[PDB]
Amino acid sequence: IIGGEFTTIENQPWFAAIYRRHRGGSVTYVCGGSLISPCWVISATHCFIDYPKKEDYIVYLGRSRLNSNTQGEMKFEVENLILHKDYSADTLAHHNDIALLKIRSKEGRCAQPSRTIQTIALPSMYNDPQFGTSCEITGFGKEQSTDYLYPEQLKMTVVKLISHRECQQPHYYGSEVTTKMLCAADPQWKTDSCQGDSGGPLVCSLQGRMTLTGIVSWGRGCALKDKPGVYTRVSHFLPWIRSHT
Numbered sequence: 382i383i384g385g386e387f388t389t390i391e392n393q394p395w396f397a398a399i400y401r402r403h404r405g406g407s408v409t410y411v412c413g414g415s416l417i418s419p420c421w422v423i424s425a426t427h428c429f430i431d432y433p434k435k436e437d438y439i440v441y442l443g444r445s446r447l448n449s450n451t452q453g454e455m456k457f458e459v460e461n462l463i464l465h466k467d468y469s470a471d472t473l474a475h476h477n478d479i480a481l482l483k484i485r486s487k488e489g490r491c492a493q494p495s496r497t498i499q500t501i502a503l504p505s506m507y508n509d510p511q512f513g514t515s516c517e518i519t520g521f522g523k524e525q526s527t528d529y530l531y532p533e534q535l536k537m538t539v540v541k542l543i544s545h546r547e548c549q550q551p552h553y554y555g556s557e558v559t560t561k562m563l564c565a566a567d568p569q570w571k572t573d574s575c576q577g578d579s580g581g582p583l584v585c586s587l588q589g590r591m592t593l594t595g596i597v598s599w600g601r602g603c604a605l606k607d608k609p610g611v612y613t614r615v616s617h618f619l620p621w622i623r624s625h626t
């Protein structure tokens with residue numbers, strides 16, 4: 382997250398931190414995700430497509446720091462890793478950038494809700510907020526495009542939804558942006574998602590309910606004039622989510 386503010390998992394208790402185990406034992410951060418039910422985390426396919434084996438992954442809930450064991454956290458293996466069969470990528474845009482992880486602890490358990498572990502509601506189909514609505518994004522991704530390191534402490538920021546019509550302008554993204562994607566940005570382009578935020582939640586308030594409106598997917602750079610963050614539009618994937626969970 383470029384700009385914004387530090388936070389803790391209490392302020393986004395559905396946030397899942399996803400890591401990969403390397404061949405020589407090391408463990409590195411991969412991507413964010415969101416707990417949509419006790420056994421299911423939703424994320425982005427592009428996070429996993431290079432290493433698509435479920436046994437490589439570790440998922441944490443209730444975790445506010447990248448490399449420290451937050452009191453109350455839970456650790457899970459990935460029982461199933463479900464990538465979207467119509468995924469594609471070109472130089473910039475990911476299509477159908479959505480993935481499900483069925484989580485299972487070593488004791489064979491799913492998530493147990495606490496002050497630091499809660500689910501996020503899915504949106505109603507084809508029901509998104511209007512352009513200009515402020516939404517929040519959360520993640521452990523880079524604080525500056527040029528950074529080598531990820532922040533140790535979780536971050537969040539606010540971005541505004543951009544109309545498809547605006548996002549499809551040539552000087553924005555043209556036809557790289559589809560109706561299954563949502564664009565969001567800061568009016569001054571000063572805050573955004575960035576590398577390492579992929580898979581994490583774009584959350585908006587619809588009818589007084591926090592709702593998983595988007596999943597962090599792609600962008601040209603980060604916090605860059607005329608280059609919004611692009612998000613998988615969750616409200617256009619409900620049958621896929623329901624059918625795979």
Ligand SMILES: NCc1ccc(I)cc1
Nearest residue numbers: 574576598599600603610
């Ligand atoms: N600013 C949106 C964005 C940029 C790069 C990645 I990787 C993911 C999301």
